[PDB]
Design a protein around this nucleic acid. Structure first.
Lengths: 208, 107, 107, 209
DNA sequence: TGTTTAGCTAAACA
DNA sequence: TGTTTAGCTAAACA
């Protein structure tokens, strides 16, 4: 099977792609998984590597949430196995396949890889995503000011809509800013679509 | 080039403030399918007079053919809300075109 | 009545497709405050012609006088879209009150 | 000190698994993408299986259908796994919920099946570790008015709380709600629905005055 | 004395 | 052959 490990011999990876304010690490979120762990136990064992710089302790590859919820349940140990060949991309992959990463988390992960001189090509390869996926998330790293406000106050969350908004703003900024400056304006695939249609109707009556 | 059934025509002219000649021209064209130039030539009118006559009656029809709740509204809106209101009108004009061709097809 | 200043008038006729006489009539009436009948009598036109001429220019004025980024729209809409257009208008006239009261507060 | 490789040919998907075939995580994009990562890096999240009581030597997936398909598409003979013979249907729901893998419809339908067993909302909530309110919201989906249903199935609306808001509105003023939905261009969201309600309240109050 | 709108023309345009 | 729209009248209206 897997093997029970003592929790106090396990540490979270500080380079894990999810950040502290990730919604899956919220008090409700952990309380909910703690609850099910108290009742039924952990049935999806976590992956750890051996900590090379601190003998006898382990580092989480995946399973931070079960690990916290195991604490919340008051457990001594937690099912696990060891896989010493588990790198940062493997973590991104696992988290992506669980939809656990926010657009910002993904963009920031891509930032870090670019900063190491990796190319879009290879970042795409190493998380099993398309060059277009990388491009879309790169846009988030340097957003125009008002589109940034919208994104960080969570008026717009969808990476593809944010891209659609930025494209619109690159061509007709004043208009895009007026649109955003209306407190009542919902930002969605559809509202943005209407915005683009409107803009295109004006360019034509510029040449008319 | 577009047509009305007898009953659709009758409904368009009901309470319409227009004289006999406009009625005669419109009936000829929208009901009897005769070309507007016929009337221009025979009444000695410009093609534009006759076009206008037909248009009065045709408008009247579209006004009576609206479903309940429809109503003209006027406002001063931000330009992009103006666009949407215009897009709304188009989609609605299409639905009324489908409603007319269906009444006529039942008749 | 309806009166304009020469500069307001200038702006209304800018790129208006209208001939000399309409301009002459409208300036006479809207700017100089002369009564429409004077022009009717002197150009040998019906009172209706003169009214129409004034009206063309006056409308043109109201269109150009709408705050920039706004537009008049008119349409026949489902009841639900009617409501929205009305809610939009209210929120818009509030934002213009804040724009006006702000210019006025600065200068 | 590990999981164990099992042959794929000895493993079968559980046919009562709470995810339905049209689940977006079972789309060809989804599976081909996981196949790709499996070919390159291997399966690093081992699947859970139980022994098949009615068919010696064979297994049933507790969790890991997607890895299992992706493993096949990548051309693997085997897949990392461990056996956990104490894994029931609620455990499956819970694991899928923890991964946000279940659609609102999938959750509602799971709740329908439990209701149909004479279980009470109380205990269905308990068994998937959720609130009474969660159960109630999803129960609404089991008996939707026709047009609201179409909107939900075509995916025009996906948020269970908006669907709830729609039904309330439709219970009071149905023909109007149907006209609103009969417009293909009308986006259904917390905010658009809010405007619908405001509109309805403007009519109700010219109905009495 | 001004407004409105069916009805007409002209004449560029579709 | 049909449409558009400034500009004109007539005539009911306030």
């Amino acid at each position: 099977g897997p093997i029970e490990l003592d929790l106090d011999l396990i540490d979270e990876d500080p380079h894990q792609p999810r950040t502290a304010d990730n919604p899956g690490f919220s008090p409700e979120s952990i309380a909910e998984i703690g609850a099910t762990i108290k009742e039924r136990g952990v049935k999806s064992p976590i992956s750890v590597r051996e900590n090379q710089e601190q003998p006898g302790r382990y580092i989480i590859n995946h399973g931070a949430r079960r690990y916290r919820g195991s604490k919340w349940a008051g457990k001594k140990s937690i099912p696990a196995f060891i896989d010493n060949d588990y790198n940062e991309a493997d973590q991104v992959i696992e988290n992506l396949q669980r939809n656990e990463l926010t657009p910002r988390e993904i963009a920031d992960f891509i930032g870090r890889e670019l900063a190491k001189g990796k190319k879009k090509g290879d970042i795409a390869k190493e998380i099993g995503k398309s060059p277009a996926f990388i491009t879309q998330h790169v846009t988030l790293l340097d957003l125009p000011e008002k589109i940034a406000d919208a994104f960080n106050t969570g008026r717009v969350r969808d990476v593809t809509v944010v891209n659609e908004l930025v494209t619109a703003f690159k061509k007709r900024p004043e208009e895009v800013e007026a649109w955003l400056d209306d407190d009542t304006q919902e930002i969605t695939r559809g509202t943005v679509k209407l915005l683009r249609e409107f803009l295109d109707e004006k360019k034509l009556a510029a040449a008319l | 080039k577009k047509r009305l059934t007898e009953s659709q025509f009758q409904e368009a002219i009901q309470g319409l403030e227009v004289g006999q000649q406009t009625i005669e021209i419109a009936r000829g064209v929208l009901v009897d399918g005769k070309p507007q130039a016929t009337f221009a030539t025979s009444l000695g009118l410009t093609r534009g007079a006759v076009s206008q006559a037909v248009h009065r009656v045709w408008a009247a029809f579209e006004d009576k053919n609206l479903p309940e709740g429809y109503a003209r509204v006027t406002a001063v809106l931000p330009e992009h809300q103006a666009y949407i209101v215009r897009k709304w009108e188009a989609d609605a004009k299409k639905k009324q075109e489908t409603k007319r061709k269906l009444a006529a097809a039942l008749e």
